[PDB]
Design a protein around this ligand. Structure first.
Ligand code: FDE
Ligand SMILES: Cc1cc(Br)ccc1O
Length: 137
């Protein structure tokens, strides 16, 4: 289920992070402009860029901690707060997270592994919800 899925992603996290994030950037090409230097790059080009690799891993390093501290796919109120306050991230939006999670659920759906994709779908919704309530627009 959801807990075992955290262990599976964590076990090859750099490749899972890049591949789901690329699935996000390719489903919603308008997202690349939040990472402007990403625009007009192939998947293999992005994967060559230091900050792409490092940043996508840290996104996922963080989202796996929030998934691990969640109960029944509901994150800690405290976790959403910290995220809304995050230095250098004043401009994050909940609509951009819902897009990330759509991409993550389709990825898990299209894989031949027993991911609990309904659970991630729930988690995605519940994280947006907690982000909304913590004051992310
Ligand atoms: C969703 C999400 C999540 C996250 C998380 C995180 C963690 C844990 C950590 C981090 C870090 C970071 N960020 Fe982070 N993140 C994100 C996003 C983002 C964006 C959009 C940006 C912008 C970029 C520019 O260009 O400015 C960022 C951003 C960021 C930064 C700066 C940039 C560079 O160049 O490097 C940093 C350092 N981020 N991060
Ligand atoms: C640009 C952006 C990306 C992600 Br992933 C989440 C939020 C946000 O505003």
């Amino acid at each position: 289920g959801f807990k075992q899925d955290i262990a599976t992603l964590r076990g090859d996290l750099r490749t899972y992070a890049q591949d789901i994030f690329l699935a996000f950037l390719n489903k919603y090409p308008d997202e690349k402009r939040n990472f402007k230097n990403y625009v007009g790059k192939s998947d293999q080009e992005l994967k060559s860029m230091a900050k792409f690799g490092d940043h996508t891993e840290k996104v996922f390093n963080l989202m796996m901690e929030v998934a691990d501290r969640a109960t029944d796919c509901v994150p800690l109120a405290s976790d959403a707060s910290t995220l809304v306050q995050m230095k250098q991230h004043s401009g994050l939006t909940t609509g951009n997270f819902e897009k990330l999670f759509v991409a993550l659920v389709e990825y898990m759906r299209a894989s031949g592994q027993s991911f609990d994709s309904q659970s991630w779908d729930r988690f995605g919704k519940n994280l947006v919800s907690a982000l909304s309530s913590a004051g992310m627009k």
